A paper describes a structure:
In this study, we focus on a resistance gene cph, which encodes a phosphotransferase (Cph) that confers resistance to the antituberculosis drug capreomycin (CMN). To confirm whether proteins in cluster I also confer resistance to CMN, three proteins, Cph001 from Streptosporangium roseum (accession number: WP_012891209), Cph002 from Streptomyces sp. SID8364 (MYT78782), and Cph003 from Streptomyces filamentosus NRRL15998 (EWS93654), were selected for disk diffusion assays. The polypeptide chain of Cph001 is folded into two domains, an N-terminal lobe domain (Met1–Gly97) and a C-terminal domain (Ala98–Arg286). The C-terminal domain further divided into a core subdomain (Ala98–Ala140 and Thr182–Ser246) and an α-helical subdomain (Pro141–Ile181 and Asp247–Arg286).
We then performed mutagenesis on the codons coding for the conserved catalytic residue Asp189 to generate the Cph001D189A and Cph001D189N variants. Activity assays revealed that both mutations resulted in complete loss of phosphotransferase activity supporting that Asp189 in Cph001 plays a critical role for catalysis. Degradation bands were observed on the SDS-PAGE for the wild-type Cph001 after a week of storage at 4 °C. This might be the reason why the wild-type Cph001 could not be crystallized. After multiple attempts to obtain the crystals of the wild-type Cph001, we switched to focus on the Cph001D189N variant, which is more stable than the wild-type and can be crystallized at 4 °C. Crystals of Cph001D189N were successfully obtained in a week and the diffraction data were collected at National Synchrotron Radiation Research Center (NSRRC) on beamlines 15A, 05A, or 07A. The molecular packing of Cph001D189N belongs to the orthorhombic space group P212121. Two polypeptide chains were found and built in the asymmetric unit. The final model of Cph001D189N was refined to a resolution of 2.3 Å. In every Cph001 structures, including apo and complex forms, the two polypeptide chains within the asymmetric unit adopt distinct conformations: an open form and a closed form. The two forms implicate conformational changes during enzyme catalysis. The closed form reveals that the α-helical subdomain moves closer to the N-terminal lobe domain when compared to the open form.
Residue numbers in the entry:
A (entry chain B): 2 to 286
B (entry chain A): 1 to 79, 88 to 286
Amino acid sequence: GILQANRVLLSRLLPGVEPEGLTVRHGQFHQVVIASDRVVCLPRTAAAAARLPRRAAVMRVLAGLDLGCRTPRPLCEGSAEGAVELPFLVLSRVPGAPLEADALEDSKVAEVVAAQYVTLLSGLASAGADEKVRAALPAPQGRWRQFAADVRAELFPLMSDGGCRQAERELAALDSLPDITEAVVHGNLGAENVLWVRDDGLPRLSGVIDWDEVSIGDPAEDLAAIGAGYGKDFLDQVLTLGGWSDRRMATRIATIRATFALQQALSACRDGDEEELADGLTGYR
Amino acid sequence: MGILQANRVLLSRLLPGVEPEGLTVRHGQFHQVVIASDRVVCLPRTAAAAARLPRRAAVMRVLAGLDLGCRTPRPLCEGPFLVLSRVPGAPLEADALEDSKVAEVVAAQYVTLLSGLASAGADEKVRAALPAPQGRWRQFAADVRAELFPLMSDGGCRQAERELAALDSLPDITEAVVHGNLGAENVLWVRDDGLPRLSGVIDWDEVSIGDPAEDLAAIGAGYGKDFLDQVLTLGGWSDRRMATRIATIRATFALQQALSACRDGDEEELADGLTGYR
């Protein structure tokens, strides 16, 4: 038990809470323990521990952006960012729940939901043109070519020959992608990481969670995630309202969206999440 | 007509599909605030407040990026209006501190918030964006003599002058971000999931670069000196010279209330604030 292993530390961070009653999501680097109003990241390795000082900074930068919504706020002191290593990192919990695709069948909901996606993405785009933001966030080069290699190395062994051939087409298209480093890119903006309130009216975007893969990147990565989850008609509505329906943007989205399930499977592989892996490899084995 | 109907176009955009008559509105400090489930809409009463509202959004954006150990109201939208996130939780009842396990834990979380506020004193966005007025206590001393002494007994006037003299002798410190109104009501907690956890702080209307003793005095007013002593000892603020600045600011709280209520046309607060001075 990740909760049992870490019993003493949690009793200090969450005094008077039974750790058995808490929930856990798995990350690549850290395990996130989920309490009622806040989340505790626990590093899995020393290298993960050495990453948390930069995480605190990243999350503080995000907390100051104009996204039209909330983000998980670092509850540490600022000085934590100067550390070599943190043994944990506490963040505020964003309220709300995922929006199921069915709710987009109502036309006026779809419009209001798309509008709020545009505000978020517009804010991320413009923040990616800020030099202080760009200096605080990772901005790797050749991420597509290297993602392809990682899929072949880590996922192909789990696939069928037919799955390997489907994936090869999808991954080869990547090499032709311009390597764009223009926007703040969430990098895993599936519906599960986007939280809404539906208590007093039409859906209102409350916030966005799971920023582990955030970078300076190509906004087409986030728009592909949306299109993977909600399909072409809703994606087109977001592109129109945002001013992103050009053929160039739309081609990068198409290319990236064809890999989005492999992205989820690679993440599930690395964080040990078996059902998430089985789901992501549907049609490849 | 009323505020909801009058502003209904705007609220239909900001709160789509939300029946306006189901909302609650609070009278505020040059600000009408429409409360929705997860956010509030700030509308300026006065044309002066409409002019100053872009600046308030800016301050709230800066506070949203500070490391205070808790939530603050985040600007979600601006236009004239300002939409802020609502902070979850509720004030802590002074009675909760009878439990000494609760008292230590609440005290420690106050230390984090005050430390964060102190540290942010040196931040560039902070010192740029937040008001940092000079002569605060001399200007208030003149305001009191002008507006309140005419309402006071002569013995009251003696007492106030003794408290206003003490206040003049204090150094004009602009080191920390100061909430400026850090009473029990404005600090929100998560209860009934174990021991109390600080969720966030609201009502930043009077926020400035100033002297943290003001915030410590407010904590003292709300919860008493035993709880405040616990905070000062944990935070390493238990020296002589801090204790004097607190006690001196603390002594002016009824006068501050009287002066506010005297201006705002609130006769209930005025009489209560003037209690020992007439």
